[model samples]
Target: VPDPNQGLRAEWMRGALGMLWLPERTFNGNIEGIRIDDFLTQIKDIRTVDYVQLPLTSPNIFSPTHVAPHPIIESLWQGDTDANGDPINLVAPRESVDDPLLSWLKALRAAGLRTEIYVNSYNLLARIPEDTQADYPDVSARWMEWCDTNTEAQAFINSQTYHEGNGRRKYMFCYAEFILKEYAQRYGDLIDAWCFDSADNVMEDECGDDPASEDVNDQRIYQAFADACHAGNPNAAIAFNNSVGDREGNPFTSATLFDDYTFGQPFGGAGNMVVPEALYTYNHDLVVFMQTNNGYAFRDDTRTWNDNVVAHFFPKQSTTSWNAGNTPCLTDEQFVEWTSTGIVNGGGITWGTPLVRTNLENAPVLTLQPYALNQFELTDTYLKEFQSPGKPNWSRQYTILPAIYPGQPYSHNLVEGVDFWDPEGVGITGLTASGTLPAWLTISQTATGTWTLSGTPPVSEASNYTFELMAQDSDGVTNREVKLEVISHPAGFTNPGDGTPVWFSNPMVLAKATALKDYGSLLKLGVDFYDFEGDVLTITKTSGPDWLVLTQNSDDTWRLSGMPTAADAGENSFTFNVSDGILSSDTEIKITVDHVAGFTNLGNGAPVWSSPILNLTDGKGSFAYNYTLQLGTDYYDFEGDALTITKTSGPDWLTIQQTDANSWKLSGTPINSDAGENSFTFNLSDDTNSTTAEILINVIATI
Candidate 1:
């Protein structure tokens, strides 16, 4: 069967306003004679009341020797006289007419209020009439046999005769079971709850009429009653009052495992009321009598009391009355305080008031005392305003959050009250970010009221985003603006010195003049790089030749500077990278060194002629001396560039002629006068720069 304990606890934790109606006949008047409609109309304006408890049977109605009067009982005439001078024997047999208890339940439910039935177990058992016993022999014999066999029960019953003001009363467990089960099966659906008054007296081991061991029998009895109730309506809440005497002690302080709620009936007044620190398998429902402090009588009708006043008056005189008087139990302030405190601490409260009987012996109508009803109405108004959940408030508005790098995991936790708050401490139920969030970011709220903003930012999502965060509770919603910034990775690119864009992926070639030997100026190589979020970039040389030096300028630009020597001659490369802490980019720089051109045969400083002297012989008549020389075989350039020879100065007797790019011819007939010595000067050029050389010649006379 579905247990109603959890559902009841949940509802009561929110708070429950309740009232108890005690309908019993007293020497002063008969409360039971009141019209049901009049009672309903009186309580109709109690808008905040959650439930009303009505008595199914009352100990006051049954004489010391008679069974309690209940609508479900089948009565037969007996020789004994009732209070109205009527002979009666109460027996259990379903009545054919509509039961008044069922009608009351139906009416209470129809009026949009929950109903609870109070059962007085002390007056449940009585002597069966002899003629009635003869008619139901089997059931009657079983009941008498049980009472006679249990000596412990018989002694306890005899002891209670003086207090009960009657002869020893016999009780049968089966009879109680039959009566309760019949009531539950018939009206459980309409009944919202059930409470057994004087429960401990009937079930304690001292009474000793149970069919099993003390502990086992208690369990069996409680379970059977609960099952019977569930058989009709599984959701009906159940409680058992364990108080001894009349409101003698704090019975609501403890709880039983089988109950759905605590039976809190404070004695005297609410001055000593203590709310439970924690619940134990049950919801708290504090039931207190408002009309009387000792819980035995209503306030005197002739005396007038204000709704806010606390009266010190004695109860109507009775033989069983305690020395304690009927004090106007709880003032309006006290009632509201206790009710609010109990509910805030996770429980509920109920006020018990004695019905006022009017027009006795004729048309009687039960009504609530105007003062008590006014107090109840005031409490109802206060609770309705007090229990509403508070609206949410942000601790501070967030303008900008810390920066996050692309492709990195980020998270920030928002604390309750620090980030958002519930002004009344009722707690927030919903937290969310409004508008479309970035695909990379998300927000989540925990059951403990902690909110977290978390996500991994992708490389493509490097930018700033703005949105509003909202917090909500039972009261309403609240919002605050926030900005999140995602920083981009550092980037490096080839310096587009001439307006041509060059990215880091492409290789960069340094100026060729920088690699030339003995070049006057230092070749400076630079690349362009920048951080999207304006973060300071750290430049690093990842890999490179030793001759290549890398440096970052004051303007935040990177430069590679090196003057190449002969050793660093061809196709040298280096790599450098830049970073903004979160991400990095690297680029490669290429260099090609050129060899300096010079002559090898002639020292690079100056050219020297290696050829010997040329001799010219004189011929008779028209014969002339001629000689041809190759310049390439005599002079060589370091880079193998073709050389050109030019005659700068030569003797008139010896003429110089050009034959090839590197060759020159000098042939002439030398006379006796020119025989001594002849000198010729010529210039050699390797195309880049030029050098000069000299040739010596000697003339011989005719031999």
Candidate 2:
């Protein structure tokens, strides 16, 4: 087992005792199946591992800078020739249209792997000084002119004055923000950790010639990077390669800045292994990580790193660190032993181990998506008096074997009461073995073709876990894999403790007092769990309009099923009595159904139309004669409740007809009126408020 405090802190990084990851290799040498679409199945097969890591190293597609080749950059060149002034080509080749980084991120996440990228804070190749003279000065000179006119690039150029220094910070902010925004824009949800190189130099252990000056100056700039990262992606964690204890402006000190801390060592165990007191002194309370020698993993040093002097830090009041190792020499035994030690020492094992699948499992049966299944349950509930004691929380779960709406988006509630699809006319059974499933979950084949998954969810862990279940239809063999996430607490309504209020227009599915358990996880209405004496005691209308009805829907949300035929405008209130078969709690709900503007279908209001399409011009001129038409469909107060429209404009040649107290009609006859275009308008009202509409008629002369 890995020693305690292997230094893992991110929520997803938890429970990773036997962490396994596919390490970085040259693009050609790396295993092929690790690509996007196939990787999830890869994870589904290897059931015991904790986490997965993929490294993006040198010679990789993302390693090179791409902007210098842009036509924009080529056009800014100072001369028609190169430094030699001979006829030469200027425009560089365009890169691929597809983005490699984004594609891989999507694939990594689809497989449920914990993804981490190895990239520098700023791509050094894009960092160039303005007005420079070198052997190959075209790229630099052209880049300088390109930066001059561009707003963001120009601002980056002006961010700092001194061009000569240990580390020129030009374009630092832009580059960091560029990548951060790009990743956060689309692939934010898939990524886990982004390790920015903390060392002063791009590839070395030194902090810089001026530690404090660099720290103080770069601190704000670093925050800009952190700010951009978060604005781009709130969940993707940020850490540094050589962070925390190293320099004065250690990136780890940003309590409000970053997510995790990484302590790296390149000289094996030659450097100080003890995480400094300053790491504990900081306020951020971030997760800490320890690693040594980028490409070289030393097992002995790792043992000492985990078991020796660092072991005491486990009980430290402040520091939270983990153990990590790499290099060809690193063994599983060492990893397993180190992990075991971590558990014993009161720490977590957040390291990643390489994976090799020995067997190909059966193509998974029982199709299920890993979506909302990963959210926690709502912990609170409030109810309107009209709502029954139950909610139609049940959603559809689908089946592929006896495909219903085959190849369609399907859903099923594992809580056994509903009908299951059996198109094959074959028997099917479902049972969960395990994979990220909550401890209490149990699945059993109920009726001939139905299966129910029922249980209480976990209290603490919020990350999504995979659930593996088996579905067999006599001759058709299959297994089901679905990721489960629990939100376990979404309380609402008058219950102050509930996150959201639970109110309904009417109670349909026995809207009794809903305790945490009364809310079943299914759809297509079913009765609330009813006990003769212990269920809801009674329901009463404490206040408001009394027109309400309750019933249950097949999908379960039928509670508060009926609407008021004659609803009083504005808010209406009701009360509900709930008991967990024992203690009772009181809650209330409010309904605010909307009513129309009751317009005459006028300007900037409800739309009114003139029917019986008119021929404005008839070669005979005005023979179109008198027209009988009216503004159609007036606004409603509610369903069936109508409003009246009356003539409101100047009375000229149009007359209004009152068909009923709630309706109107109109007819028009113009007399020799070359009055050209004239208007007829009307007012619509529901007794209390009114608005207007217009009708235009043209009396034109033909040539």
Candidate 3:
């Protein structure tokens, strides 16, 4: 099984022990006395160190008034001559005339260490000799214009004071691109990483006016350099150093999109040595200052005329000063605290070696103090023991994959360095899958050792799947559990009256319409929708009658309501659709409107009696006479409203009761003395109109 984080920055976070190497100008060639073999011996036995940084140029060594001792690209410095009127030598005198930088890179790689080339943007413009003005007039004029605009009397001051709109800052960026691209293209394959120093200084000069615009401008500037570097070597990591802290005195918690790692400089104290809880696109690598040394200190005596002429351009002393031979190393305990803290927090540490002037007149070189080297060796031993047996370490032991809708294409790449990594650098040899995997899902390994999970889940297979993956390397195997859920769209719709009603604050009542009488109030009916994924649902009236209106409430229930007229006294229908964006369901409703007989009269549109008389036999006290009168049958109204009947002129013995909306019951008992022709006059009304109707009953004397 391959380590999930095989090629990721997590590998560095766990196993990387970086060391900084700052060589003098003499290292460029054996003619000045430092051979590649001699330089390799200095770091050959540093077993604990896995990452090494080499500066292509430094602001201290190559000042504004002086040029690089040997320019990496000869063409850029072409036509330049010394005081002797002879062309200046751009290439150092190597054994075979091949670049020493290339030889250094090959030696480091052979030593099993990752190499990074540091580029100082601050000193880049100064290294371009004036002789190149004839060959590249545009770039030369802009360089001179930037110097004229930003420098005071040919002396560069605070870069923060640079004018915002002047083309000087842009020119600086262009010049950096010009030189850095040449370095990248020439030796990009040998370089594993690129670090651009003094990025904060360049940004302050260019985008200082608007802090909000800093990220935008920084991306533009850094991306250009990143593109140039990648053009040479696509896999080379990129970093932009902004120093120890931002304006807030805190380490930068984020990184640019293009850079592969944080430019971590946790130099000051224990407070500065903290790892951010959340990692950005890149891994965090803290550059810890290990030795006390002066900054930009050069020998004042036995220097060349070029170095002496620029003596006045030296920078201020560092905050913590130490003499050339008296630098103090960080205690072993302090080194352990910094390194262990970074490792446990998923980060790494790089020792910022002190620069010491071994010889009087030569450039300063990075020197790992004796005690510091011992500390590094001890830490390395501890790390080797800590990662014993070298089982693959997984960045994530458990993860929940993103949800995918049914019938939709889903793909996920299990990255080597991001998910798991092997500390021994022995990449994964094989991957094994176990546990339940749906037939629709498949796991496949790419030629690059990364695994990809892809499939199109069908609607029938919409469910959660749990699986286990094991990755094996030369050391051992590691396992991770992952969960994938296939989502389904809106399942179906529930018509009104399908389930028990849930009372709401608004008291919404959903019902299925059976028979709705014309001019009668229509009861509101609703439909409930269902979604397997619990996604938000939107209900719409896709095809509904003009008279019928559908309304969706906050609870997602849809209501159908409309009053039917006489013309609508038939089977009325409408349709509604509910969707969760991915899938949809529709429901149709049918309401039967029954017509009621009524009359549009000139007067009171009241119930008119069909007969003026109603006869009933008296039981003569043995039994009571009873009769029921139907409102619509006996008396009628044009409108289909219920009528109220009142006995206006009936006998005291007679009693009336309303049994239903359309009927009235009449019951009365009469003795021999009550025998007579009785007339009962009743008033009928439909609440809006009224009329009188008389029911005459003849009660006879019975035996």
lDDT of 3 at 480: 74
The lDDT for every candidate, in the order shown, is 0.49, 0.35, 0.49
Tens digit of per-residue lDDT, candidate 1, span 1-703: 2232523422331245566665443211132212255566787555556667776655422311111233423422223334323223433212331234554565566455677666655533433333333222233334455555666546644653322221222343433444566667767567766666555655543343232222433344455556666667777766656551133333243333345554544433222122232221121222232222222111222312111111111111111221111333445676566555554323444456545543333433356666567777777566544554466755311323557766657777776744556667667787888875788777886437777788888856666778887888778897877777665334453333332322345476555632322222121123245544444567677786666666543223344555554446568777766666666766676767664333144446333344433333333323476766654234544444565667788767666677775566766766766655567777767656787666666555554
lDDT per residue as tens, model 3, 1-703: 1112212322332335666655543322222222234334555444455566666664432422111232433333345544322234232333223343554565565455677676765543533454442212333344455445643423322333332243345555444455566667877666777766666655545434221232444355555567777778877766666555333322442344444554554434322222233221011222211111011101222322111110000010111222122333345665665465454323444455443443313633445545545666667655543543487655421334667766556776766654556657767676777999878777788658678878878856656877887878887787777677655333233323322232121222233232232121122112244544445567676664566665442233343555544345456666656566666655665566554334224455555665556554444544578888864346655555666778899678787898876678988777677677877888877767777767777777776
Provide the lDDT at 85 for model 3. Answer: 29
Q: What would you estimate as the lDDT of candidate 2? A: 0.35
- Which 10 successive residues of model 1 have the least lDDT summed? 309-318
lDDT of 2 by residue, 38-145 (tens): 334433333223334344322122232221122342243334543212222222222211233444554444333456555544343323344332323344334434
Q: Candidate 2 — which residues are off by over 4 angstroms?
A: 1-9, 14-43, 48-50, 55-62, 65-97, 126-149, 156-166, 202-218, 243-259, 263-328, 342-703
Q: Which has the higher TM-score value, candidate number 2 or candidate number 3?
A: 3
lDDT over C-alpha atoms for residue 657 of model 1: 79
lDDT of 3: 0.49
